[PDB]
């Protein structure tokens, strides 16, 4: 929806269909890991919190940007960690 309007709009919808399409046919046993890893993926928020923190002037901007980035990074770090732990339930003990 920007850079520029039409192009971006295709990008929204193309991704919406694709997001959807990849997930159809997931077995039930894979629900929650999928859930965990997609949770991880949206962790990219940091990158936008980053840019916000790194362009902040007034200082109320500092704090909330700082939060943003802490929140962001938890999302990623945690997500990754959790998904890995979930995935190990599938492995035999050697």
């Amino acid at each position: 929806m920007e850079f520029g309007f039409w192009s971006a709009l295709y990008i929204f919808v193309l991704t919406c269909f694709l997001g959807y399409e990849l997930i159809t046919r997931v077995p039930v046993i894979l629900h929650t890991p999928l859930m965990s890893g997609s949770n991880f993926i949206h962790g990219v928020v940091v990158v936008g919190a980053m840019v916000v923190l790194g362009h902040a002037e007034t200082g109320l901007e500092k704090l909330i940007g700082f939060l943003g980035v802490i929140l962001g990074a938890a999302n990623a770090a945690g997500g990754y960690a959790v998904t890995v732990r979930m995935l190990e339930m599938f492995e035999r003990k050697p």
Partner: protein, 264 residues
């Protein structure tokens, strides 16, 4: 900045393939690894944004949040994983809101459909944030698991929702930093109000829902500011998340409307 662009495009591919692989028995384990790099690349590459500063505050913030979360994730019992996924998804919502909120304080857009988008993101994300924390609270028995009911709440929630949206819109014409805070508080409040009625045992579905929520929230935040990394990934997950929510509901032999209340 075709370089940052190159990196974000590869990041996009890494996420897609990664999400694709998380979805199949034989590829699942490697999926998260692929998505892994996507993030590395994304984070690295974003240091190179033009006009970037406050690095120390950035590192400090990256280190704190990544370390405390990883530490927690690695120590909890397996049977407490649903709530963990919840808290980490909360914080994403928050993230999307923090983005939204700072660009607003900077009245950084003369394009108003973009302002719109940021705001929409800020609402959804704030909601996914507090809604995920309440979910957490219930699974942890910090809060009553059962649906928490009160005399005429269905209306209060609608009413709080509508007020929020309205003051949300209000920012387009007028955005006294006063009204900004009000908007988030209402958004946040509504997250809380929303999840009170959700039974403990319904929670994995609501968690998926909020996952979809934050996904969408970041995608929106992504378009509004010009960030492709976010644009693609947010919606990807927003999309896949909403479908996932539907199949989870179905697996529980339950409807998502059913979950979203179970008593008003």
């Amino acid at each position: 900045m075709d370089l940052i662009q190159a990196a974000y495009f590869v990041v996009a591919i890494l996420f897609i393939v990664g999400l694709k692989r998380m979805a199949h028995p034989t590829t699942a384990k490697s999926g998260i690894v692929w998505a892994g790099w996507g993030m590395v690349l994304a984070v690295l590459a974003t240091f190179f944004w033009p006009g970037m500063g406050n690095f120390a505050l950035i590192l400090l913030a990256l280190l704190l949040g990544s370390v405390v979360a990883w530490w927690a994730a690695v120590r909890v019992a397996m049977t407490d994983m649903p709530q963990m996924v919840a808290i980490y998804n909360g914080m994403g919502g928050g993230a999307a809101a923090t983005i939204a909120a700072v660009e607003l304080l900077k009245g950084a857009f003369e394009n108003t459909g973009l302002m719109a988008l940021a705001i929409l993101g800020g609402l959804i994300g704030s909601v996914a944030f507090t809604g995920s924390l309440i979910a957490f609270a219930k699974l942890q028995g910090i809060m009553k698991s059962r649906p928490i009911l009160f005399p005429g709440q269905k209306a209060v929630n609608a009413l709080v929702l509508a007020l929020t949206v309205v003051i949300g819109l209000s920012l387009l014409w007028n955005d006294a930093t006063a009204s900004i805070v009000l908007f988030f508080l209402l958004a946040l409040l509504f997250g809380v109000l929303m999840t009170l009625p959700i039974g403990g045992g319904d929670m994995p579905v609501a968690i998926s829902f909020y996952n979809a929520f934050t996904g969408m929230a970041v995608g929106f935040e992504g378009f509004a500011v010009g960030n492709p990394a976010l644009m693609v990934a947010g919606t990807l997950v927003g999309a896949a998340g909403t479908l996932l929510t539907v199949l989870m509901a179905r697996a529980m032999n339950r409807s998502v409307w059913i979950s979203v209340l179970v008593g008003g």
